Paper text:
The structures of TgMORN1(7–15) and both P21 and C2 crystal forms of TbMORN1(7–15) were subsequently determined to 2.90, 2.35 and 2.53 Å resolution, respectively, with the PfMORN1(7–15) structure used as a search model for the molecular replacement. The two subunits in the TbMORN1(7–15) C2 crystal form and the TgMORN1(7–15) dimer make a rather straight assembly, while in the P21 form they display a bend of about 30°, leading to a rod-shaped particle appearance. TbMORN1(7–15) formed an extended antiparallel dimer in both crystal lattices, while TgMORN1(7–15) adopted this architecture in one crystal form. In comparison to the TbMORN1(7–15) C2 crystal form, the extended TgMORN1(7–15) structure has an approximately 1.5-times smaller dimer interface (601 Å2), which is contributed by residues from MORN repeats 13–15 only. This is closer in size to the 747 Å2 interface of the P21 crystal form of TbMORN1(7–15). The final C-terminal part of the protein seems to be flexible and does not engage in the stabilisation of the dimer. In comparison to TbMORN1(7–15), the dimer interface of TgMORN1(7–15) is not built around aromatic stacking but instead employs hydrophobic interactions between Phe350 and neighbouring small hydrophobic residues, such as Leu335 and Leu327. In contrast to TbMORN1(7–15), where the dimerisation interface is centred around aromatic stacking, a hydrophobic core plays a crucial role in the dimer interface of extended TgMORN1(7–15). The dimer is stabilised by a single salt bridge formed between the Asp308 of one subunit and the His333 of the other subunit. SAXS analysis of TbMORN1(7–15) and TgMORN1(7–15) indicated an extended dimer in solution and the crystal structures could be docked into the calculated molecular envelopes without difficulty.
Numbering used by the authors:
A (entry chain AAA): 147 to 355
B (entry chain BBB): 147 to 353
The structure:
């Protein structure tokens, strides 16, 4: 059995009001035309809680959704979906700050991982797409083009293990086709890579300069 | 206008004797059966001078030939040809010490260059053939097989310029075919070289 305690206008809930839904979990805050509208808080049966701005019975504008588990989103909503600027903390400790579209990461975004890794760059369909920089915990670093959370196209990868930066084509997160490899010495290699293994050397200069 | 002044036996020059030849240039020393034989010296018209051992009218045994120019050979002769152990100084300043055959370098020999370079190894037909070590003035060094004064077959070459060492096949004084290349880092490369350019990579590692 559902129930309400608040302000009535015309024949509908309007103004401040607290509402208990048939399923466990309540709402307290602002109402317009019998819909949740304005600043209010919802406590869900599943233990999740939203407090922030509503419009036409949905989360719209700035709001904070904290989950039963660590997960917490602080940012903007449009029609009950995460939309625009937003910061999401994952249970893991990983954090995304940046641009959301239709409950997916889309645009400029920085994801700082709990393992010390961090990526900043362009996102599309909730995955890295376009330019970006991944800096690995170990000291390895990528800078260049991404396709579907994979290093794809022209990129520069540095390997902390042996120095030796690579400049060239990437395919499916591995270096493929023409490229250049500088080692810490000043030794450079030009040629072709096949699935991350060097096949052919075009040039083999030194020129430390 | 020939002439002689020395010892006669039977009907020929025999014992000590000095001889002036038709062309300018003389001989003074030992004679047998009217031939230069034993210890004696010849001063040639061309300005060359030999002093050493003779047999049957030719240089045979140990002798010293000093030339019109700086060139000087100290070693063994057989029938007027440089033969066996010998040391030759060139006008250049270069020195060869070692084994000669029929007036050509043949066997074990060390050539010390005036530019600081040095080769030691096996010679044939007056050129490096078989094993040997060339050490370059700059610090570069080769050790392995030679064919006709060229690095040919299995060899190890070190390049002082980039402190890298290569182990593999050489063809015509350049690295060709399968080989391994270690760099100063610890990075090693396996694969095939063509002329002196890497074509194909088998392995690539860091140590």
């Amino acid at each position: 059995m559902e129930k309400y305690e608040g302000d009535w206008v015309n024949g509908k809930m309007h103004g401040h009001g607290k509402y208990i839904y048939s399923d466990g979990g309540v709402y307290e805050g602002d109402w317009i035309d019998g819909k949740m509208h304005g600043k209010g808080t919802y406590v869900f049966p599943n233990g999740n809680v939203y407090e922030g701005e509503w419009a036409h019975d949905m989360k719209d504008g700035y709001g904070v959704l904290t989950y039963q588990n660590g997960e917490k989103y602080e940012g903007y909503w449009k029609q009950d979906k995460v939309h625009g600027k937003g910061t999401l903390t994952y249970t893991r400790g990983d954090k995304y700050i940046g641009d959301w579209m239709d409950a997916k990461k889309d645009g400029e975004g920085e994801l700082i991982y709990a393992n010390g890794d961090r990526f900043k760059g362009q996102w599309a369909d909730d995955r890295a797409n376009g330019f970006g920089v991944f800096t690995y915990a170990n000291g390895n670093r990528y800078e260049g083009e991404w396709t579907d959370d994979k290093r794809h196209g022209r990129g520069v990868f540095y390997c902390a293990e042996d120095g030796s930066a690579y400049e060239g084509e990437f395919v499916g997160g591995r270096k493929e086709g023409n490229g250049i490899l500088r080692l810490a010495t000043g030794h450079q290699l030009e040629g072709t890579w096949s699935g991350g293994q060097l096949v052919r050397v075009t040039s083999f200069v030194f020129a430390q300069d």
